[PDB]
Protein: mH6
Amino acid sequence: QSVLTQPPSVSAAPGQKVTISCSGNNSNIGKNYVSWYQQLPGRTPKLIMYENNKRSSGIPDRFSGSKSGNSATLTITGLQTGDEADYYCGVWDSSLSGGVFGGGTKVTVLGQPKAAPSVTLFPPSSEELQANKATLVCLISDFYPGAVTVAWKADSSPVKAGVETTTPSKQSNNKYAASSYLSLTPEQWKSHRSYSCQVTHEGSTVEKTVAPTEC
Amino acid sequence: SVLTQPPSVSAAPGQKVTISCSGNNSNIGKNYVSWYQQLPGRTPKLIMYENNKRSSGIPDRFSGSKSGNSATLTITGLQTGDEADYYCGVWDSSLSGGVFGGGTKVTVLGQPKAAPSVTLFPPSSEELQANKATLVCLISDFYPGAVTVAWKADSSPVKAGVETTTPSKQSNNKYAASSYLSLTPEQWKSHRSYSCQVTHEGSTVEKTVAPTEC
Structure:
């Protein structure tokens, strides 16, 4: 169980500053020691901050931790390429008697203009339905920074199963792409009036819809 | 770390792996132990609490035990989706804070090759009405995470407009990618069909889509 909320994405131009907030409650962030972890691409997560504001060895003074009430923050000044990573907050929860973690934040050092994703929502193909299978594909392309949050709905109701979203990858145009897909049975697909893919990018959200219809 | 864990444990699929964690009388020996799973690129998730209790929806394969100043996590019948970093957590009554082990990387050895599932989508009516056409070749459940993609317009290679994403580990540590070909509504309607050829571990999977009468 996790109550710790962090922004999915933060970014700034090199030399600038980012702040990564993590909001919790009294049982966790409010009464216990907050740690921060850095997860570099394809690397094991390393402790960078502990006891709210103590830097781990080798971590530059540009990185600073703070805590106010039930929320903790990791601030990074003089932002440089090597700070690009996913960061997450970790804290003891005294009511739960276990550790709770933030959902993580990708930090991007802006090297090009920001671009809103192009969202193209594909219904299940005829060939697929003929095989009693159904896959909804939400193609997400031409975005920068390379981080998206995807949420699917079936008639305004959040989908909690069969969702897979790829990790953004830099394409030939230097912008990112990803696809999110939902595996359903033709019955599940036809039992609902519509399906929606909601794509969040830098606090900007776009929702697209698809419904079962014959050619 | 305050708690001592082995760095790695590796086993063939279906085998039993053991992860032990040692502490003292103030932490493991006194307080309830929890276990955390961290899938590559994701955050740690609690899988075990109160030494032997599984968290919501955690599979039966996972079991936990506690003896004296030690705790063990056992994965019976190992799966490729179990490949993760595992951490032991507990409250230290001496330090009056929560302590963890250094983590154990669980490797699934001699991992079987998994052929990609290939699903090809034509441009939807909505897209074509907006004067656009994108074909998406969805490539899922493969292992290892390397694919080669080639597209054909009728039986002629498509040497432009092709983009394929870098394979990425899905929930089950298998891979997914997607190839997409952007065309004009005219280029789409002109041809009899389009093909997407996926090459994985020297084997090819080809799918074909043609414009419909609407």
User: Anything to note?
Assistant: Chain A touches chain B through 46 residues (CB under 8 Å). The radius of gyration of chain A is 20 Å. The longest strand of chain A covers residues 134-143. Residues 186-191 of chain A form the longest helix (6 residues).
